[PDB]
C-alpha cells in the first residue's frame, strides 16, 4: 500500500495538484478540498498535534499515520538537492495534503477499497 | 559606497513560529473557531484571512478597508 501511496504522491508532484504546506492545507480545508492527507504521529511537537488532529477530524478527511516529520521531506521533496544521491541540507514539514485530478490509476481500485472499507 | 546619512531599513518579513494557531483558536471540543475577520466580497476566497487591525479591517487584495 506504501508503494501505491508513493506513486500517488509522485503523480501529484507531476501534475502539481497537491497543496504542500500547512497554509495551503488550511486553504484547502477552508475551500473544502481535502481528499487524502498524511499525519506524522509520535513526534516531539508539544501542542501542534492537537491542532492537526482537530483540523483532520472536521469533514471527510482520511486518517493516515506515519512515524516522523523529517522522513516526509523526501517524498514531497522540500529540499531534494543532489537528486543522484542523498541531500546534505534539508528541513522538515508536518503535513502535505494532495488534491489529485488524474485519479485513475492501477492500484487506485485497491486504494479506494481500503479507504471505503 | 557609504554615505554620511545613515541607511534606513526595509520592511523585511521576519520569522514567526506557528502563526496559524494565532488565527484558529484551539477550543475544547472538535470545532473550529475563527476570531479574526474575513473578506465578505466574492473577489477573493474565504481562505484568505484579512488583517487584524485595532480599529478597522484591511482587505487582502482589493484594499476595501472596513471601518466601524
Ligand atoms: Zn482578501
From Swiss-Prot, chain A:
PROSITE patterns: RIBOSOMAL_S12E (PS01189). This is Small ribosomal subunit protein eS12. Keywords: Acetylation, Cytoplasm, Nucleus, Ribonucleoprotein, Ribosomal protein. Signal peptide: none annotated. Part of the small subunit (SSU) processome, composed of more than 70 proteins and the RNA chaperone small nucleolar RNA (snoRNA) U3. Subunit of the 40S ribosomal complex. Its main location: cytoplasm. The gene is RPS12. It holds the Pfam family Ribosomal_L7Ae. The lineage of its organism: Eukaryota, Metazoa, Chordata, Craniata, Vertebrata. It is found in: Cytoplasm; Nucleus, Nucleolus.
From Swiss-Prot, chain B:
Residues 1-13 are annotated as: Disordered. There is a cross-link at residues 25, 31 (Glycyl lysine isopeptide (Lys-Gly) (interchain with G-Cter in ubiquitin)). A zinc finger (C4-type) spans 39-62. It comes from the Eukaryota. It is found in: Cytoplasm; Nucleus, Nucleolus. The modification N6-acetyllysine is found at residues 22, 31. Monoubiquitinated at Lys-25 and Lys-31 by RNF25 in response to ribosome collisions (ribosome stalling): ubiquitination promotes subsequent activation of RNF14, leading to EEF1A1 ubiquitination and degradation and rescue of stalled ribosomes. Deubiquitination at Lys-31 by USP16 is required for maturation of the 40S ribosomal complex. Component of the 40S subunit of the ribosome. Part of the small subunit (SSU) processome, first precursor of the small eukaryotic ribosomal subunit. During the assembly of the SSU processome in the nucleolus, many ribosome biogenesis factors, an RNA chaperone and ribosomal proteins associate with the nascent pre-rRNA and work in concert to generate RNA folding, modifications, rearrangements and cleavage as well as targeted degradation of pre-ribosomal RNA by the RNA exosome. Part of the 40S ribosomal subunit. Part of the small subunit (SSU) processome, composed of more than 70 proteins and the RNA chaperone small nucleolar RNA (snoRNA) U3. This is Small ribosomal subunit protein eS31. It comes from Oryctolagus cuniculus. The chain holds residues 83 to 150 of 156 of the full protein.
Amino acid at each position: 500500500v506504501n508503494t501505491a501511496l508513493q506513486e500517488v504522491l509522485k503523480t501529484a508532484l507531476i501534475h502539481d495538484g497537491l497543496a504542500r504546506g500547512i497554509r495551503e492545507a488550511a486553504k484547502a480545508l477552508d475551500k473544502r478540498q481535502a481528499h487524502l492527507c498524511v499525519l506524522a504521529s509520535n513526534c516531539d511537537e508539544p501542542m501542534y498535534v492537537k491542532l492537526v488532529e482537530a483540523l483532520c477530524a472536521e469533514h471527510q478527511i482520511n486518517l493516515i499515520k506515519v512515524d516522523d516529520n523529517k522522513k516526509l521531506g523526501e517524498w514531497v521533496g522540500l529540499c531534494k538537492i543532489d537528486r543522484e544521491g542523498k541531500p546534505r541540507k534539508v528541513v522538515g514539514c508536518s503535513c502535505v495534503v494532495v488534491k489529485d485530478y488524474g485519479k485513475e490509476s492501477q492500484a487506485k481500485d485497491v486504494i479506494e477499497e481500503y479507504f471505503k472499507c | 559606497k557609504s554615505y554620511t546619512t545613515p541607511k534606513k531599513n526595509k520592511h523585511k518579513r521576519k520569522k514567526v513560529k506557528l502563526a496559524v494557531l494565532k488565527y484558529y483558536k484551539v477550543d475544547e471540543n472538535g470545532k473550529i473557531s475563527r476570531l479574526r475577520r474575513e473578506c465578505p466580497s466574492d473577489e477573493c476566497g474565504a481562505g484568505v484571512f484579512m488583517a487584524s487591525h485595532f480599529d478597522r479591517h484591511y482587505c487582502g487584495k482589493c484594499c476595501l478597508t472596513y471601518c466601524f
